[model samples]
Target: ATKIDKEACRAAYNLVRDDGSAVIWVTFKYDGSTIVPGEQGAEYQHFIQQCTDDVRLFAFVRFTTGDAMSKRSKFALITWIGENVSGLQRAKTGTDKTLVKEVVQNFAKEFVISDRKELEEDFIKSELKKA
Candidate 1:
């Protein structure tokens, strides 16, 4: 199993805990034995664009839910497994996910998307809404 560096773990918590910023999403990529931030911003499309084939990424996203009378903020943990990734690489991500969960402790829903078409913001919102 790969080890998640303490610093990487700390950074992930801070990114998830921060509610006072323009950043609405954070993506993490593997670095040897560590997991580090790839990119983070308010742009959902940009985040989706980062989920290319042959790579795996974990994302923590903040979303707005509810309507008319009320609006609420929700968080989601998305595990992106690209289609072109090898079986060995894909299997390794399962263990990496457990390490990631150590920092990203809370989420309303969890999802795994291998296809780009499944990485839409509206689709994720709908799924979260169902939860």
Candidate 2:
């Protein structure tokens, strides 16, 4: 690496921190033309800058070998955001019982992320509120 582009890294971090989208693409070196990253034991090291704790990102990868490399790309980078809204329920003054109900509300331009795995798909009615 010749010189770390400190300013570029700073701007990218700031944009994502604001809960905005930023392009995450690779700029490949011309086939057998331009100079490339240093290699060690048939592997090359390319360093991408890091993000702060508040920033979140998602990426998916699929391997491409011989014939599959020519496939055109389809860039549908969609995002989903959700937030929790809670309400407290308490019985009449004489009784002694309290409950807290929390549910996710409308999407937002910016939000924090959690990478929890789900057994199924889209959100649904709560099981806690059954008949």
Candidate 3:
């Protein structure tokens, strides 16, 4: 598996921010390594030191996955709570083109566009019934 570098991850985050989106939170999960609970304090301190007025640090969480693959390799998923279509478009076109293709292809493999509306309606109905 290809590992993402810290610099590239930061660049991706910046790209998202540049297009007017704010990342309210960031989460990192690695296998086998125990993250010190207050480690973020130091990391945030460093981030502030570097990009003081450029960006705002909202929240961050670090944890271990404890899965088989994670035990030997590092894996992480980042979720951002903002939308920057232009930035996403550029990132998908530029640096992370392969990731974009994988994501879209996975979705395409699972979903049929012709039945999307029906599937959505069925899901909503099921949720309502559960309520």
Candidate 4:
């Protein structure tokens, strides 16, 4: 890129950071519901962990939330890629970086329009290619 876009990064980060899940709380001594024993307690942590740990699940879950893709949510996905992801300080052109912004928005839009959460990998891959 011609220059690293700090403004772009900040904008994206702020948007995604605005919303996402990280809920807490429940009752102790359940009425024979979701009760696990021994080392795991209610196994609540483990139960949520299963879903959260699967990164691909985020892609699936993101679309199911509502009609419009939260702009913030789209920004979060891109921000995570741009920052935490490494080795991108190479010769990628400014146009390439700009193109990514376009792709991310459209990519988010594509999934948001779909009716169901359980989407197909083939369908997802096809859109990415088209975008």
Top model number, TM-score: 1
Local accuracy by lDDT, each model:
0.82, 0.19, 0.27, 0.26
Question: Would you give me the overall lDDT of model 1?
Answer: 0.82
Model 4, total clashes: 0
Provide the lowest-lDDT 10-residue window in model 2: 93-102
Colliding pairs, model 2: none
Error of 2 at 47 (Å): 17
- Candidate 3 residue lDDT tens string, 34-114: 211111222323322322222211223121223575332111222212233355433332333233223222110111111
TM-score of 4: 0.19
Could you give candidate 1's per-residue lDDT for residues 11-66 as a string of tens digits? 76577557777788888888877787778878888888899887898999888789
- Candidate maximizing lDDT: 1
Candidate 3, which ten residues in sequence have the lowest lDDT sum?
105-114
Superposed Cα deviation of residue 79, candidate 3 (Å): 7.5
Residue 121: error of model 2 in Å? 13
Query: TM-score, each model?
Result: 0.90, 0.18, 0.19, 0.19
Query: Which of 1 and 2 is ahead in lDDT?
Result: 1
Where in model 3 is the C-alpha error above 4 Å? 1-62, 66-74, 77-81, 87-131
What value of lDDT does candidate 4 attain over all alpha carbons? Answer: 0.26
